[PDB]
């Protein structure tokens, strides 16, 4: 804290409490007894534990029929309107599209759709699977999952 | 009628003015006016001016016939105080409070 180490007043004779510095934490305008510092909150998770949780999550999605497997999922042109129509007739509004190969055409179509996400099998995280109401996996996307999950 | 009238930020202290206020509380305006006229206090002329204003407000903005008016309510409230530094002996300093007050007078014909 900006200031000086000079004692505000003498140790004795003054009728007030003993003070040592203007920057003491019990003083106005300067203090904070335990000041925070920039810290890393990331924690270690074992590889097997990460895989086990991912396997556990996928199984339960299948059990709650929240996971739908279909053939290749693609859009002819990079238009959000087309993607909205394709998801409308399927009665899906909050979906996570997982495809084996990432194509810019599908990536751009879903960019402006908040409730819709497009992802690759490699870039799969537990939070996304849990958060999204429905998960749609392509045939290719499914295959890569077992290979990486093993 | 209400026909209130107040004077805010009077320099006189609330305690000192409050002695004069108690004299005329509940009395008719005619008796209140000459009571203040012959009261030897600074607060007397402050309160009298407020009472004159209240009577004028009733006469102009409200019904006439100010003869039958009475001071139904009168109270003095402490106002903002000005802090001043007054040197004392041995290089000591002390705070002088210039106390103000709000004088409120309410007159009615009933």
């Amino acid at each position: 804290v900006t200031g000086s180490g000079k004692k505000p007043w003498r140790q004795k004779g003054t009728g007030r409490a003993r003070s040592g510095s203007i920057k003491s934490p019990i003083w106005r305008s300067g203090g904070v007894t335990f000041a925070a510092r920039p810290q890393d909150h990331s924690q270690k998770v074992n590889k097997k534990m990460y895989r086990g949780a991912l396997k556990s999550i996928l199984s339960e999605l299948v059990r709650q029929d929240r996971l739908i497997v279909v053939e290749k999922f693609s859009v002819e042109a990079p238009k959000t309107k087309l993607l909205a129509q394709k998801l409308k007739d399927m009665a899906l509004e909050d979906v996570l599209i997982i495809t084996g190969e990432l194509d810019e055409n599908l990536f751009l179509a879903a960019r402006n759709l908040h409730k819709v996400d497009v992802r690759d099998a490699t870039g799969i995280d537990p939070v996304s699977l849990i958060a999204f109401d429905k998960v749609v996996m392509t045939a290719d996307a499914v295959k890569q999952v077992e290979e990486m999950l093993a | 009628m209400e026909t209130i009238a107040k004077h805010r930020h009077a320099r006189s202290s609330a305690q000192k003015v409050r002695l004069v206020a108690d004299l005329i509380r509940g009395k008719k305006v005619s008796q209140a006016l000459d009571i203040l006229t012959y009261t030897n206090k600074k607060a007397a002329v402050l309160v009298k001016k407020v009472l004159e204003s209240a009577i004028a407000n009733a006469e102009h903005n409200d019904g006439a016939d100010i003869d039958d008016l009475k001071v139904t309510k009168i109270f003095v409230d402490e106002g903002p105080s000005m802090k001043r530094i007054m040197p004392r002996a041995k290089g000591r300093a002390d705070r002088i409070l210039k106390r103000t007050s709000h004088i409120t007078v309410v007159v009615s014909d009933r």
């Binding site: 007043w9 003054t14 009728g15 | 000591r92």
Partner: peptide, 17 residues
């Protein structure tokens, strides 16, 4: 509002009962 006091005081005859 601090007003530091720089007033030393005289040393009286200590109790020394």
């Amino acid at each position: 509002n601090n007003r530091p006091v720089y007033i030393p005081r005289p040393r009286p005859p200590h109790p020394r009962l």
